């Protein structure tokens, strides 16, 4: 199937002293953002009628209940430990939990840890891993979050057990969005001088839906290794936007164009032609 | 330890004088969190701005997408501005068609 295969929660967790720390997270199919959540009153916002997934009413107040009570909690304990982990203020604790489907129907878990923007640890079979980045730290926050059975199993219900499930009733609830098709629109310019007698030709790709995209700098039927591509970035309302560039000799341009493969096109590829003497 | 903003300011669909359009800033590449995001329109913020909520690539740095609805014009100017920790004042990255 097209669109997302997983679903993740984020955690930013800010500590600016001793008396201030807050929490800012929220919930995603992959880049596509579906829960909001409110800091200090710790409630949960979903952003599309289908958020809930196949989740019932109840099930989805017991587990905003969860979180609400983890964050405050969190923040609590990172407080009473600061002295004894060495923190110096202000700190910054991120994390990501979640699950995704593969092909063959295997839906995985996954749970990361950051302190400072570096790696701090991460869970494998139900276990606490400290990563090197983290250092005696990590290794002494897993040796204490171990001591607490009931964390543990928690976070084992909620990897393994609730989000496979709310997972796939989530990417079912929401096919409409998920799975629809939406069409690029392209355009050509000219960048800025890579080198002596040199052009950049650019190839503008957006609003397509979903994600994977090719775009070639083309001769004919001839792709051109030179092509570079850009990074992938959004718009607003789900569609992305990409540029591939092509760096070539004044004289050498003419004869290139820019084709674009996606879904929606349906093998109907988009084909620009860069013409010369400024006749774009 | 800290990682100062990028900014990249695109618009959604190629400029065409007096055709509506969407200017976009994609904010990214920093750490910490705390930031500060305007869209300018001849070094004034626009209030009608619509942002993401926080979010955070494999390297565990932060990004945002600002954007607004806009009509390029021959003279109007617009802009994307940040105020990160890294920097000592805003950030001003101009949109070029
Ligand atoms: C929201 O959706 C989830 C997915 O539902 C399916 O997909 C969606 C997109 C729609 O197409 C749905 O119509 C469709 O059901 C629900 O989770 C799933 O629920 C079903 C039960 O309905 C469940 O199937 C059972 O599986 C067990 C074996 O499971 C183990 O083994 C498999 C590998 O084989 C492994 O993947 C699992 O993790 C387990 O280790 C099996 O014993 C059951 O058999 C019994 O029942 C069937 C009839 O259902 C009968 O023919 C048999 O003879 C026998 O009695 C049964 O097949 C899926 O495993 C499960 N999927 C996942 C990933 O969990 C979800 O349903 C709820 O959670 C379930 C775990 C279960 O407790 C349900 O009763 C719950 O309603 C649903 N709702 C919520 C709120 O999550
Ligand atoms: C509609 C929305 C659908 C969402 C679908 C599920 C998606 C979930 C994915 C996995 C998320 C797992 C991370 C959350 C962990 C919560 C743990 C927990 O117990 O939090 C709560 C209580 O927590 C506290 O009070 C303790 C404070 C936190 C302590 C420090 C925790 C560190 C982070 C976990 C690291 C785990 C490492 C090893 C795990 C095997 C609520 O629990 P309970 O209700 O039983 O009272
Ligand atoms: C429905 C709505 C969906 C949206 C919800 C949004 C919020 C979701 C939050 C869940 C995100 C889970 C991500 C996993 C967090 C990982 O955290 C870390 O890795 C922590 C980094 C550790 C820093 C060390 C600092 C020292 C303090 C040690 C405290 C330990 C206290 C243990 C006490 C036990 C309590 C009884
Ligand atoms: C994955 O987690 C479970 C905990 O429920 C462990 O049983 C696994 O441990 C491995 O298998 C057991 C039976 C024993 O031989 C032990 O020495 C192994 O480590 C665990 N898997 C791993 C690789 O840690
Ligand atoms: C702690 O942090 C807040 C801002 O997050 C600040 O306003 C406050 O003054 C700090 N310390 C004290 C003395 O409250
Ligand atoms: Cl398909
Ligand atoms: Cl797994
Ligand atoms: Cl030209
Ligand atoms: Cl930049
Ligand atoms: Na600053």
Known sequence: ?280 | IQRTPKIQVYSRHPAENGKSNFLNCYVSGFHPSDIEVDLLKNGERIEKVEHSDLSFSKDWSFYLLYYTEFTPTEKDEYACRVNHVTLSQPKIVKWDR
């Open chain 1, 1 to 280: 199937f097209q669109g997302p295969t997983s679903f993740h929660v984020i955690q930013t967790s800010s500590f600016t002293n001793s008396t201030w720390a807050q929490t800012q997270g929220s919930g995603w199919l992959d880049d596509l953002q579906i829960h909001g959540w409110d800091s200090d009153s710790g409630t949960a916002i979903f952003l599309k009628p289908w958020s809930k997934g196949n989740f019932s009413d109840k099930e989805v107040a017991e587990l905003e209940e969860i979180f609400r009570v983890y964050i405050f909690g969190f923040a609590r304990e990172v407080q009473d430990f600061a002295g004894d982990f060495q923190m110096k203020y202000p700190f910054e604790i991120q994390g990501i939990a979640g699950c995704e489907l593969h092909s063959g129907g295997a839906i995985v878990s996954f749970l990361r840890g950051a302190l400072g923007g570096l790696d701090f640890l991460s869970v494998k079979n139900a276990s606490c891993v400290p990563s090197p980045e983290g250092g005696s730290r990590a290794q002494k926050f897993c040796a204490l979050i171990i001591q607490y059975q009931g964390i543990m199993e928690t976070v084992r219900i909620l990897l393994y057990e609730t989000c496979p499930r709310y997972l796939l009733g989530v990417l079912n609830a929401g096919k409409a969005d998920l799975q629809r098709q939406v069409k690029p629109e392209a355009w050509l310019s000219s960048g800025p001088s890579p080198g002596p007698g040199r052009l950049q030709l650019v190839c503008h790709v957006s609003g397509f839906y979903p994600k994977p995209v090719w775009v070639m700098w083309m001769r004919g039927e001839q792709e051109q290794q030179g092509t570079q591509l850009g990074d992938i970035l959004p718009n607003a309302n789900w569609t992305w936007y990409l540029r591939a560039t092509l760096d070539v000799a004044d004289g050498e341009a003419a004869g290139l164009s820019c084709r674009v493969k996606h879904s929606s096109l349906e093998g109907q590829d988009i084909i620009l032609y860069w013409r010369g003497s400024g006749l774009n």
